[PDB]
């Protein structure tokens, strides 16, 4: 198909994320190639190279078509594409499980593989519910979180997403009614944690778990909070016997400047989800980890098992690339890489603070955010960034980047320059 | 890792489908290769080649490592592994969506890609709920199904799975309470459809959709029902203004002897899900299709959009291997192949009817089932079949197979022989 044929088919037949059919303000841009930090996109019938400043939605940490990850895929392809995980096991699952339990916060000793972040969140919720049932406390079935969060799009996942951002108006009484604390502030405020505890105390007997994104809330608004809150959450959860679940689907694998965002606080959750960067952005794969105690309590309960088992559970191909992606990350000085990346974002985004439409500029590891005073118009922003050789996709009032770890200092400055120019335009109407 | 090392890591750290940690009666068997219809498994520490009678849980329709599918993946890998589907589109998505709209039952014009069957089911449910909100009828939010079904493991999907199979007993107070009709029978009985309609009619004002597996109910018990039931459901849903959703995640792509099981009935659902065999068993991918009416109504609704968007939506690699898989199926006489396989299954399973513990033997396309009168002991059944060069995984009282379409007559004879032998041992 030609780019124009692809556009025709797409407009008629393809749903996009959170999109309409037939009512799109802009056609999607055709992508024809991806290599390293660069995408080849079609603009006015001509191919252009632009930087993937979004890491293709947080996924492409090593960039596209990395030889180590390509080779990992083709090597696994040559022996075994997939077998069912019911009754069989294999080397890719075992290797990845071994790696994951070694590098995640201490105590996370078992691994349940699934195909997407949303599913891994539901698995985590199931683990928590079956846990309490194994303890003779089936009343403990609700979840608690803070506002501003995002945990995926399946119906249990939605129930703990920010109610305003996810227009929960659309749903309910179909959505489960969960417990929400106020938005967690950026700066540490002991009063917030005290009120969180007081709220939790009122519901402790009906709560299976607190579920939060640690340090960075992604799709809910690219907000950062002080890691000390996570220490408070751990303590509250321990004292009130509520499980603590960290959703690290966006934050995992070095993105915030630590291997996992929990590491900024030295905190171990009872249950943890990982996903987006797990395969280096090649294939869908997620994992839910839990402690030995959680696993043994579920296993000793009425069901005798965790009642979940996706078709492609522990897919050999996905597990193989993920093994290579994690090993590639661990085999280099990733911490220095991310620190340098953050310094580049900070230096490059500084001039945005003085722009009329800009409310905040914030950086946390390989995450750079310009917060504007109005919703960013994509019909203006997207082509403006493409004119500057960068793929940017703002959402709501945010012009942001989560660049691949392989971006050079020059590439980071090109990315931040484009973000600055988009923000300048936002203040021009 | 060596097989011995794999087993050790596995026992300590790996969950399996619906399994325990530390309480497994039998270790899982180490798989080390898969080629064509055969798996290489480790038995007594030695690699042995056995037939994948289960198609690796319905997925491996063209067998493992099919040169055309390996090549499709390898070719895409050199071009573009993945890009975000927010604000971008690409050739593998467009090619696959065109194929899928062309070959599915008439009227399914739009395609929402996701990464698994359970997600595609929740997407279908979301489409139904947003559709009726768009029509100014927000009370229409419940689902109706018949018993015996399986639709996946996410919490909404669980709410329409069979209450007994799904151990809803362990879920008291957490699942949505849905509307269940009695088990749909094998043989066509107009009284069943009339009762179904009467039950639906009294709930019509609160029902968004009927959701069923068409013709074959898989993980809920490998039960077949007369296609005419689906004709009746289409009629009932039309007349009572309730959307009809077929979950073809197990039945799709030729498995029941029609390209999609809805084709047996000559009926089109408003929303359809596909998944397991979509990529030919290479990679996780699923799709939810809906009519233009559903799509336009959602898009004119209050959200102005379907409120869903998975990270890996329309992944180029998965879409590329799916295109090759679907084209491979469509470019051969698949209909004859499935007919031959069904004949092979019928002939090979016939002697099992006489066996003392066997209550039923049934075949539908490339699906063969021996139903026994008691639970099949996996500790006995599985090494028994392995002894005979076949990988089989019974569940409950069922010894069954969904072999790859590439299985030769000799291979079907071998699978069926092993199945008969497992059923014999059950009677002991
Ligand atoms: C909810 C219905 N049940 C009964 C508890 C199911 C459903 C599906 C499976 C799938 C199983 C399985 O074999 C596989 C799941 C995914 C790849 S193979 C399994 O062992 O137990 C199940 C049990
Ligand atoms: C439920 C929160 N919302 C609604 C405001 C979200 C959440 C996530 C996305 C992701 C989007 C997206 O760009 C992508 C989704 C998957 C790959 S890219 C998007 O366009 O809109 C969203 C909207
Ligand atoms: C993206 C994301 C999810 C959902 O992952 P999918 O693969 O899109 O289903 C869940 N939680 C967090 C924190 C995320 O960033
Ligand atoms: C397997 C199956 C599902 C769920 O698919 P996963 O990919 O395992 O989540 C849904 N519906 C039917 C009919 C199935 O057979
Ligand atoms: Cl019809």
Q: What is the DSSP string of A222-288?
A: -EE--THHHHHHHHHHHHHT-EEEEE-TTTTTTTTSSSSGGGGTT---SEEEE-TTTTTTSS--EEE
| The residue to which tokens 């209050």 are assigned | B302
Q: Which residues contact A191 (CB under 8 A, 6 or more apart)?
A: none
φ, ψ of residue B324 in degrees (nearest 5) = -65, -40
Span from the CA of A166 to the centroid of ligand 2 (angstroms): 10
**Known catalytic membership, residue B150:** yes
CB-CB neighbours of B333 under 10 Å: 9
Resolution in A: 1.9
Distance of alpha carbon A205 from its chain centroid, rounded?
30
| The residue to which tokens 């960067």 are assigned | A277
Q: Which residues contact B323 (CB under 8 A, 6 or more apart)?
A: B72, B92, B95, B96, B99
- Quick check: A88 and B29 in contact, CB under 8 A? yes
How far is the alpha carbon of A351 from chain B, nearest alpha carbon, in Å?
27
- Quick check: B292 and B56 in contact, CB under 8 A? no
Q: Does B52 touch chain A (CB under 8 A)?
A: yes
- Quick check: A26 and B105 in contact, CB under 8 A? no
Q: Which residues contact B115 (CB under 8 A, 6 or more apart)?
A: A115, A116, A119, A284, B284, B285, B286, B310, B312, B313, B315, B318
If we measure between CA atoms, which residue out of B151, B124, B113, B158 comes closest to residue B311?
A: B113
How far is the alpha carbon of B85 from chain A, nearest alpha carbon, in Å?
6
φ, ψ of residue B209 in degrees (nearest 5) = -160, 155
How big is chain B, counted in residues? 428
The partner residue sitting opposite B90, judged by closest CB among A31, A153, A170, is A31
| Residue list for the binding site of B | 57, 117-118, 150, 247, 276, 309-311, 393
The partner residue sitting opposite A64, judged by closest CB among B73, B80, B125, is B80
Q: Which residues of A5-35 are buried (b: 16+ CB within 10 A; e: fewer)?
A: ebbebbebbbbbbebbbeeeeeebbbbbbbb
Q: Which residues contact A291 (CB under 8 A, 6 or more apart)?
A: A107, A108, A109, A110, A270, A271
What is the C-alpha end-to-end distance of chain B, expressed in Å?
39
Beta-strand relationship, B29-35 and A390-391: unpaired
Residue A309's SS3 state is coil
CA dist A215 and A260 (Å) reads: 10
Beta-strand relationship, A38-43 and A29-35: antiparallel
Residue B55's SS3 state is helix
Dihedral angle sign, alpha carbons of residues B210, B214, B218, B224: positive
B219 Cβ below 6 A of ligand 1: yes
Distance of alpha carbon B32 from its chain centroid, rounded?
25
CB contact under 8 A, B302 and A170: yes
Pocket test for ligand 4, best of B117, B252, B367 (most atoms within 8 A of CB): B117
CA dist A420 and A415 (Å) reads: 9
Q: Which of B52, B162, B226, B247 is catalytic?
A: B247
A85 Cβ below 6 A of ligand 1: yes
CB contact under 8 A, A20 and B299: yes
Span from the CA of B222 to the centroid of ligand 5 (angstroms): 25
- The C-alpha angle with vertex A425 and arms to A422 and A429, in degrees rounded to 5, equals 140
Residue A211's SS3 state is strand
Q: Which residues contact A368 (CB under 8 A, 6 or more apart)?
A: A345, A346, A348, A349, A362, A400, A401, A402, A403, A415, A416, A419
Task: Let me know if B354 is exposed, middle or buried by CB neighbors in 10 A (0-12, 13-18, 19+).
Answer: exposed
Domains of chain A: 1-65+333-429 (3.90.1150.10), 66-332 (3.40.640.10)
CB contact under 8 A, A70 and B54: no
- Atom 13 in ligand 2: residue holding the nearest Cα: B86
Residues in B closer than 8 angstroms to A153, CB to CB, are: 119, 122, 307-310
- What is the experimental method? X-ray
Q: Does A179 touch chain B (CB under 8 A)?
A: no
Task: Let me know if B177 is exposed, middle or buried by CB neighbors in 10 A (0-12, 13-18, 19+).
Answer: exposed
B309 Cβ below 6 A of ligand 2: yes
CB-CB neighbours of B126 under 10 Å: 25
Q: Which of B52, B115, B131, B150 is catalytic?
A: B150
**Where is chain B discontinuous (C–N over 2.5 Å), named by the preceding residue?**
none
Give the position, in ligand 2's atom list, of the atom nearest the Cα of A153: 1
Q: What is the 3-state secondary structure (H, E, C) of A89-125?
A: EEHHHHHHHHHHHHHCCCCEEEEEEECCHHHHHHHHH
Q: Does B206 touch chain A (CB under 8 A)?
A: no
What is the 8-class DSSP label of residue B185? P
Q: Which of B3, B14, B25, B307 would best serve as a mutation to test chain A binding (most A beta carbons within 10 A)?
A: B14
CA dist B331 and B323 (Å) reads: 12
| The residue to which tokens 């953050």 are assigned | A342
- Quick check: B392 and B55 in contact, CB under 8 A? no
Q: Which residues contact A302 (CB under 8 A, 6 or more apart)?
A: A133, A134, B170
The CA dihedral of A131, A136, A139, A143, to the nearest 10 degrees, is: -20
Residues in A closer than 8 angstroms to B377, CB to CB, are: none
Q: Which residues contact B398 (CB under 8 A, 6 or more apart)?
A: B221, B222, B369, B370, B371, B372, B376
| Residue list for the binding site of A for substrate | 57, 150, 276, 309, 393
CA dist A258 and A103 (Å) reads: 11
Q: Which residue of B has its CA nearest to A153?
A: B308
What would the two tokens of residue B135 be? Answer: 């029509």
- Quick check: A61 and A404 in contact, CB under 8 A? yes
Residue A181's SS3 state is strand
Q: Who surrounds ion ligand 5 at CB < 5 A?
A: B 234, 267-268
How big is chain A, counted in residues? 429
Q: Does B83 touch chain A (CB under 8 A)?
A: yes
**Alpha carbon distances (Å) from A280 to A71, A267, B106:** 13, 25, 38
If we measure between CA atoms, which residue out of A417, A355, A353 comes closest to residue A385?
A: A417
Task: Let me know if A1 is exposed, middle or buried by CB neighbors in 10 A (0-12, 13-18, 19+).
Answer: middle
DSSP B207-225: EEEEEE-SSEE-TTT-EE-
Residues in A closer than 8 angstroms to B309, CB to CB, are: 16-19, 153
Q: Which residues contact A105 (CB under 8 A, 6 or more apart)?
A: A246, A260, A262, A263, A267, A268, A269, A272
CA dist A273 and B149 (Å) reads: 29
Residues in A closer than 8 angstroms to B130, CB to CB, are: 170
Q: What is the 3-state secondary structure (H, E, C) of A313-380?
A: CCCHHHHHHHHHHHHHHHCCCHHHHHHHHHHHHHHHHHHHHHCCCEEEEEECCCCEEEEECCCCCHHH
How far is the alpha carbon of A190 from chain B, nearest alpha carbon, in Å?
34
**Alpha carbon distances (Å) from A284 to A148, B153, B169, B313:** 25, 17, 32, 9
Residues in B closer than 8 angstroms to A94, CB to CB, are: 1, 5-6, 9-10, 13-14
- Atom 18 in ligand 2: residue holding the nearest Cα: B86
CA dist B269 and A389 (Å) reads: 45
């Amino acid at each position: 198909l030609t780019p124009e044929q692809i556009i025709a088919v797409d407009g008629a037949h393809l749903w996009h994320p959170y999109s309409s059919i037939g009512r799109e303000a802009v056609s999607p841009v055709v992508a024809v190639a991806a290599h390293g930090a660069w995408l080849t996109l079609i603009r006015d019938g001509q191919p252009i190279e632009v930087l993937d400043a979004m890491s293709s939605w947080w996924t492409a940490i090593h960039g596209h078509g990395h030889p180590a990850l390509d080779q990992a895929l083709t090597t696994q392809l040559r022996v075994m594409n997939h077998v069912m995980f019911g009754g069989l096991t294999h080397e890719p699952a075992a290797r990845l499980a071994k790696l994951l339990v070694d590098i995640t916060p201490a105590g996370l000793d078992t691994v349940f593989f699934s195909d997407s972040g949303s599913v891994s969140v539901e698995v985590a919720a199931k683990m928590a519910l079956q846990y309490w049932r194994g303890r003779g406390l089936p009343g403990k079935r609700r979840l608690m979180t803070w506002r501003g969060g995002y945990h995926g799009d399946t119906f249990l996942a939605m129930s703990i997403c920010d109610p305003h951002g996810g227009m929960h108006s659309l749903w309910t009484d179909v959505l489960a009614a969960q417990v929400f604390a106020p938005q967690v502030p950026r700066d540490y405020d002991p009063a917030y944690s005290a009120a969180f505890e007081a709220q939790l105390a009122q519901h402790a007997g009906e709560l299976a778990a607190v579920v939060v994104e640690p340090v960075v809330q992604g799709a809910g608004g690219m907000r950062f909070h002080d890691p000390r809150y996570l220490h408070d959450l751990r303590d509250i959860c321990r004292r009130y016997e509520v499980l603590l679940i960290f959703d690290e689907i966006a934050t995992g694998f070095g993105r915030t400047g630590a291997l996992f965002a929990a590491d900024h606080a030295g905190v171990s959750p009872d249950i943890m989800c990982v996903g987006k960067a797990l395969t280096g952005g090649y294939l869908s794969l997620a994992a839910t980890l839990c402690t030995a105690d959680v696993a043994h309590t579920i296993s000793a309960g009425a069901a005798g098992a965790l009642m979940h088992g996706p078709t492609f559970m522990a897919n050999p191909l996905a597990c193989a690339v993920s093994v290579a992606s994690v090993e590639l990350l661990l085999g280099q000085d990733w911490r220095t890489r991310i620190t340098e990346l953050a310094a580049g974002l900070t230096a490059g985004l500084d001039t945005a603070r003085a722009l009329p439409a800009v409310t905040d500029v914030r950086v946390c590891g390989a995450i750079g955010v310009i917060e504007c005073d109005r919703p960013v118009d994509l019909a203006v922003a997207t082509p403006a960034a493409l004119d500057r050789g960068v793929w940017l996709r703002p959402f709501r009032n945010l012009v942001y980047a989560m660049p691949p770890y392989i971006c050079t200092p020059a590439e980071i400055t090109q990315i931040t320059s484009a973000m600055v120019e988009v923000a300048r335009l936002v203040g021009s109407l």
